[PDB]
Amino acid sequence: EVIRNLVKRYVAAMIRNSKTHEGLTEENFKELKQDISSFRYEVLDLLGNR
Amino acid sequence: RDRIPLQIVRAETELSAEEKAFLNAVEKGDYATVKQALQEAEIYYNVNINCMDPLGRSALLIAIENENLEIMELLLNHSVYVGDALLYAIRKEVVGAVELLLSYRTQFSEFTPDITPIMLAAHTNNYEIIKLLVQKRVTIPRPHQIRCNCVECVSSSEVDSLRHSRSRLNIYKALASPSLIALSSEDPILTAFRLGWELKELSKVENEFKAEYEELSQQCKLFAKDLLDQARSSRELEIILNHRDDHSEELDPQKYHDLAKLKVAIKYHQKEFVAQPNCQQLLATLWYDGFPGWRRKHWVVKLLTCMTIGFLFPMLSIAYLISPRSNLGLFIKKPFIKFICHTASYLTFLFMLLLASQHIVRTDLHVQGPPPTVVEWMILPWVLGFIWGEIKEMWDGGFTEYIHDWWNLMDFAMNSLYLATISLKIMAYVKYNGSRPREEWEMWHPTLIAEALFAISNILSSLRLISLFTANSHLGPLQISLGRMLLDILKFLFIYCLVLLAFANGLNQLYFYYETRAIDEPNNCKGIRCEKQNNAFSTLFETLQSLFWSVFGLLNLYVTNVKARHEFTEFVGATMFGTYNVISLVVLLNMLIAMMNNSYQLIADHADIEWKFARTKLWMSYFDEGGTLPPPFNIIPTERNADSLIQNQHYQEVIRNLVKRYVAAMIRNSKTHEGLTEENFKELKQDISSFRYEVLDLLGNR
Amino acid sequence: RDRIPLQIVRAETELSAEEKAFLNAVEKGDYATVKQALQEAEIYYNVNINCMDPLGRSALLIAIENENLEIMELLLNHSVYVGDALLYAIRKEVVGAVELLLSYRTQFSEFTPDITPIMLAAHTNNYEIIKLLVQKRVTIPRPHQIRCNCVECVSSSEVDSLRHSRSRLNIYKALASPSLIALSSEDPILTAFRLGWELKELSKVENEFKAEYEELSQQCKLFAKDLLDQARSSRELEIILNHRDDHSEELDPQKYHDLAKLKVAIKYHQKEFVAQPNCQQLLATLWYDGFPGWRRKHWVVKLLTCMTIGFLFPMLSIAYLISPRSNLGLFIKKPFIKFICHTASYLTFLFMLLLASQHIVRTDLHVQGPPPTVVEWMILPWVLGFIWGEIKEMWDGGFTEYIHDWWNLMDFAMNSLYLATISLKIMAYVKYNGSRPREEWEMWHPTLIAEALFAISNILSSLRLISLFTANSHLGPLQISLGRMLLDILKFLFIYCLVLLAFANGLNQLYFYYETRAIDEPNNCKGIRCEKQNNAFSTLFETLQSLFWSVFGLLNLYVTNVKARHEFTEFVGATMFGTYNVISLVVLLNMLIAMMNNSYQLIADHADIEWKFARTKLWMSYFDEGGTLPPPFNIIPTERNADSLIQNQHYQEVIRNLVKRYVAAMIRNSKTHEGLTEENFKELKQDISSFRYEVLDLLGNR
Numbered sequence A: 001e002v003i004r005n006l007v008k009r010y011v012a013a014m015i016r017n018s019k020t021h022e023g024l025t026e027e028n029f030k031e032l033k034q035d036i037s038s039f040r041y042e043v044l045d046l047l048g049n050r
Numbered sequence B, C: 001r002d003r004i005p006l007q008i009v010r011a012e013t014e015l016s017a018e019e020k021a022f023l024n025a026v027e028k029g030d031y032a033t034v035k036q037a038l039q040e041a042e043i044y045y046n047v048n049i050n051c052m053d054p055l056g057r058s059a060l061l062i063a064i065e066n067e068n069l070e071i072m073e074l075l076l077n078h079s080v081y082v083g084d085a086l087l088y089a090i091r092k093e094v095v096g097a098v099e100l101l102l103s104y105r106t107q108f109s110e111f112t113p114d115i116t117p118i119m120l121a122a123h124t125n126n127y128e129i130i131k132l133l134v135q136k137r138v139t140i141p142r143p144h145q146i147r148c149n150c151v152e153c154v155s156s157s158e159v160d161s162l163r164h165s166r167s168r169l170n171i172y173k174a175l176a177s178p179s180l181i182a183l184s185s186e187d188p189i190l191t192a193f194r195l196g197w198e199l200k201e202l203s204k205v206e207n208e209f210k211a212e213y214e215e216l217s218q219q220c221k222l223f224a225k226d227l228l229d230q231a232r233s234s235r236e237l238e239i240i241l242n243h244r245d246d247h248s249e250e251l252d253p254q255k256y257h258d259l260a261k262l263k264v265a266i267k268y269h270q271k272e273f274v275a276q277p278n279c280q281q282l283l284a285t286l287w288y289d290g291f292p293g294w295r296r297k298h299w300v301v302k303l304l305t306c307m308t309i310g311f312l313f314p315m316l317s318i319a320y321l322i323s324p325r326s327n328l329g330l331f332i333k334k335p336f337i338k339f340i341c342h343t344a345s346y347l348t349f350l351f352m353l354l355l356a357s358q359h360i361v362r363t364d365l366h367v368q369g370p371p372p373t374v375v376e377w378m379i380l381p382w383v384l385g386f387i388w389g390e391i392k393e394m395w396d397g398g399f400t401e402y403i404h405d406w407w408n409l410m411d412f413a414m415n416s417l418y419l420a421t422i423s424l425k426i427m428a429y430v431k432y433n434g435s436r437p438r439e440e441w442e443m444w445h446p447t448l449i450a451e452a453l454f455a456i457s458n459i460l461s462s463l464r465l466i467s468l469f470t471a472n473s474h475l476g477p478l479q480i481s482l483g484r485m486l487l488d489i490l491k492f493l494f495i496y497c498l499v500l501l502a503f504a505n506g507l508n509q510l511y512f513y514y515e516t517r518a519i520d521e522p523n524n525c526k527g528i529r530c531e532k533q534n535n536a537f538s539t540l541f542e543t544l545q546s547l548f549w550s551v552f553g554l555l556n557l558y559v560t561n562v563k564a565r566h567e568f569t570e571f572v573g574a575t576m577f578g579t580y581n582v583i584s585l586v587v588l589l590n591m592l593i594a595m596m597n598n599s600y601q602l603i604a605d606h607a608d609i610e611w612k613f614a615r616t617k618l619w620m621s622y623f624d625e626g627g628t629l630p631p632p633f634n635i636i637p638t639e640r641n642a643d644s645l646i647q648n649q650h651y652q653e654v655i656r657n658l659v660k661r662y663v664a665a666m667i668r669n670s671k672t673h674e675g676l677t678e679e680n681f682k683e684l685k686q687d688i689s690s691f692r693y694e695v696l697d698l699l700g701n702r
């Protein structure tokens, strides 16, 4: 029972420590850029006029 | 088997597939999907809005996680279970979520049971969130004194020591928060002084968690220093440093009593606060009262004016006695002038000490009870002033002064030896009334003892001059650093002391059989101080000296031989001596060098702040009106509430402006120094995802 | 006056307001606004499409800057001036822009005139862009050898030395690019070996830019090691390390056939390549050929095993002579077994050196021409083998490389001293034929000289054992580091020699007047090696020895006195000696300690790679079958195109896979760099701005 609670707390802390530990990389910038490009292309499908 | 089968050892309850998609919508920012699922949950009862993901994060925690305020209200409107959501919102530091949970009104948690919203908000140090909670009439438990034996402190420690220790540290982390102190402390500077000092003491009693408490204490010291950094005028700095917290008497004349806040900082060891450049600049103006342009002067002009005042110290001292109000009688009261006069009055004393060995009337080497000579008579008034000054300073200082600085230990020993010399010379003068050849004097003749005691005092008096290096910018920083290395060296001498005793016992145990008499030695000399060293290890007392002198290579190897020439015994004794030399000179000596090099590197990065703190204490000891006359001349014989209220009003006005500037600077410093994390990338991605879903819901055409 | 008026000193041509808004549209990503402004300028001629912003960036450079490809094409369609925008696109590393400028077919520039698209692409090290340019038949200038006196090299360095030096460095930066080497090099590993070695030599000749060339050389060394890291099987590693770069030629059967590329790496000092764990693991398998489980064995079994083979070294050596093909005659050929046999055959020689002085026959101390004794006869065959073995390497290896190794200098001196001892012993044997008391022998008696020469060789022979520490994992790393500290110590010995000579000249100049004769000294002994030291500074040769011995405290202070007792002269001479002691023992000695501590810290971070390189050379010297027999026993008396072509085909196949894996890893290693810059924030902001303008352009009911 104690081991079960310790693992639960440890897993949350490690998942917590990652989101504040390391900075951004090139893979994050590429991912963010692709999100806008996908949104731009999808929106441009509904062209009211041209 | 040759394979390890992996299985879930501690299995939790699985989450339905319908709930899995419902949580995915919240993460994606899909407001429309979440709204339908919540509304559908009111009829079908297929998915649980409180679906507990094994990680513990429900939809509400996911909504708070992504800072999506609009969705969080959507779930809150549906009566979702809150539980410890406020703590999670506070930790995330989202002002919008915290306000929503405040106005809205055993499960696994990421926080210990003792954490409260106010305590956690102070841990994050968020000024905006702390202000929101403080406005709602919150309170924090008061920690008991460190040495408390009440029923609660003892019972809690026995019931749960681990929880009791963690609860105490959590409270002190909240109280040490700069944002909380700036918001709720009447006098933030005084609060930081006391809180930081209390944490340093706690770090000693709590051995296990010393590092945690030492970081909190350092955080309090920085806050007070940073508040002082926001002063923008000399008037603001003067108001802060001259503020008196209380008005209980405190009107004793002959006392400077004008920098009360600065003196309080010195009492609490606020070295960074004292070493602040603006505080130092103001102090230098008082220290150099009579020299408005001291810094601009060439090093030759400075040196030339130092001897001129020093040579004039006898004249300035007399003027202060005859006409204190006169033009000349006021110069000695300037702190830097007074410091030079005292130094000159001490260099004169040391010069006369050199003269004690130069002019001794020949044929007087045999007077058993000789009276004081010419040099001794002049030295006498100086000694009485030194003894009187220490007793006089001890009456006001208190019997706890001897434990503050190690220089006062040298002053006590120096004065005690001088007193013993005077009494011993008096006894010899009365007991004997003639002259006898010095060769026939006994070992413990009073005159011989007095001469030895006097010579020992001379060494101590000269060494006292090293304390004056603190006033110099070049020597002070180095002298202070050297004194900080002596405490580490003293630890090492404990290991060497045991090694010396271990080998001294072994060598004496081997050689005490062969002790010889002085009559049987050449020149009738016994010991290691003879031209032909002998009886090095005959007695334990002699053995200890022999091993001490071998550290400097002054013990000859032939002392390991005995007259009977017992070859095996001599070789064993020489091997003990050889082994001792290896341990002390090849191993222990080099270990001390390595330890000293490492310790000096750490000391070197704080030398400036430590020296400036030491020099401030030196300067402030000359601001007072009490000990103006050097030792040679120091023995010659209305409503107050209105003033205190105004003085407090001005202090509060300055404190208000300092906090405003400090808060803005800290809010500014965070936005330009902290780097990005995964929480920011996740937030940015969710923003686009939410916008994409919202736009697609309404095509807007056809 | 009291104010400094600020103005533009070097004013450029101002940019019209119409152009200012036109450039702002490009930065914002406003495609619609840019399209109209370009079209408007086609008729009205109001704005300059080539508007030169004082910063030098036109619209085209701004379009390339933001990676806005579509607007770039929009500008390029309007015939905008190109200049050298390809370099800017290449530096930005935007594949789309580079392709557009390639297909598209006075002024201020951010690049020097010598930079070309291929050179700049290699500087960035972008594999994709370099491939695009290489496919279009590009070339790079070939740099001349470092020591070139041709007309072009001399003339170019005459007109513009600064430009000549920068042009050469730019070429080497491109050639050292790992991406270019992987793409255009037939043998990338060999190319990296030669290129990195050539850059190290360049960093010496071109000492002004030594740091730049040393970084390029390190970059080449890393690339070769990283290529080896991509090997995934032992077969791949075997193919790479055993590849011969089309030697043809004749190979000595006495030499080691395999590991051709590993030997090339050792020749070029590729320490990281040699120290690679997979390369080391393969070498250990060959080194421990006869012990498949050497690592798994306990340290006791290893130690017990070493002495067993060591004691049997005489038997194994004999077997290799009698029946080399026999089972026992093959053991000595195993490299680790052979190393132990040689070590055992050398420890036996050192043991007999001890026995030379342990056996004494009375009445033999007076034989002037004594013949060799029992120990000397056994030692003789060892010495002949040692001399024969060293000469065997003189012709085999060559004069140049032999002297490069410091241990060979000790081997030469040791063998020369042994040869001189033998000849001197022979001359004494022939010249004299009787026995005479040794007390009457002359100073330069041949027998006395031979004894001194023999004793000196014994010290050198024993010190040779230190070179065997390289084979040990515990002592080898420390022994290698100690030898790296000796080069720094030798520099400091230059300053001390100047100090020693300066004071030796001064002391001898003062004391040479008072030289006394040996007959006038007690015991008839003259010099500082007497019981009562005298004539310490009488001659320059004696003075140098006296100052040397005072470094160890072996010179007594009374040597500064003269018989005539000239007080002023004695004090001056003692002050010279005192000043020398301060400079050498208080100042110079501590300075050497401080420098050694700093130099050891740097050496300590490369100790592992340095030791492994040294141990690899030790191991490889026992792989060959040339010097199998230890010194005691070493004096006893088709068409090859098909094989070389196939061996090259397999090497090319492995190289192709290694480059593919390396390129992917480097492309992978950049995306996880864990960093971001402002150029990324600018690009992300521009994407939203471009999307916002495009969406807004489709307005509804206006």
Ligand SMILES: Cn1c(=O)n(CCCO)c(=O)c2c1nc(OC1CC(C)(C)N(O)C(C)(C)C1)n2Cc1ccc(Cl)cc1
Residues within 6 Å of the ligand: B571, B574, B575, B576, B577, B578, B579, B582
């Ligand atoms: C402690 N000690 C000592 O007391 N004497 C004086 C004896 C009475 O004169 C010695 O001579 C003596 C000695 N340690 C010795 O070697 C040690 C010295 C240290 C520095 C500890 N390292 O480095 C090692 C490598 C372990 C050698 N030696 C010299 C010696 C050696 C062999 C033999 Cl057979 C005889 C003498």
Ligand SMILES: Cn1c(=O)n(CCCO)c(=O)c2c1nc(OC1CC(C)(C)N(O)C(C)(C)C1)n2Cc1ccc(Cl)cc1
Residues within 6 Å of the ligand: C571, C574, C575, C576, C577, C578, C579, C582
């Ligand atoms: C080089 N030198 C020397 O040669 N002798 C021997 C003379 C012949 O016996 C000395 O006695 C002698 C000396 N340097 C001396 O002091 C120096 C020593 C060093 C280490 C360089 N630091 O630290 C300072 C602080 C500069 C003092 N002193 C001692 C001395 C001092 C004053 C007087 Cl009036 C007489 C002696």
Ligand SMILES: CC(C)CCC[C@@H](C)[C@H]1CC[C@H]2[C@@H]3CC=C4C[C@@H](OC(=O)CCC(=O)O)CC[C@]4(C)[C@H]3CC[C@]12C
Residues within 6 Å of the ligand: B306, B343, B347, B465, B468, B469, B471, B472, B473, B474
């Ligand atoms: C050779 C021995 C026996 C001389 C006597 C002892 C010295 C160690 C004393 C004599 C004069 C003293 C000095 C008298 C005045 C000054 C100036 C004072 O500096 C200033 O106030 C100016 C600015 C600065 O230099 O910091 C600091 C202390 C110092 C160096 C004192 C340090 C201690 C000194 C050198």
Ligand SMILES: CC(C)CCC[C@@H](C)[C@H]1CC[C@H]2[C@@H]3CC=C4C[C@@H](OC(=O)CCC(=O)O)CC[C@]4(C)[C@H]3CC[C@]12C
Residues within 6 Å of the ligand: C306, C343, C347, C465, C468, C469, C470, C471, C472, C473, C474
């Ligand atoms: C008392 C002192 C002077 C030592 C005894 C003298 C010699 C007998 C010593 C001196 C140096 C020794 C050598 C130092 C290093 C090595 C390498 C060592 O090689 C290994 O197998 C090392 C394996 C590993 O890496 O752990 C084998 C023993 C040997 C030849 C040693 C054999 C014994 C030697 C010759």
Ligand SMILES: [Ca+2]
Residues within 6 Å of the ligand: B390, B407, B408, B411
């Ligand atoms: Ca005192």
Ligand SMILES: [Ca+2]
Residues within 6 Å of the ligand: C390, C407, C408, C411
């Ligand atoms: Ca050799």
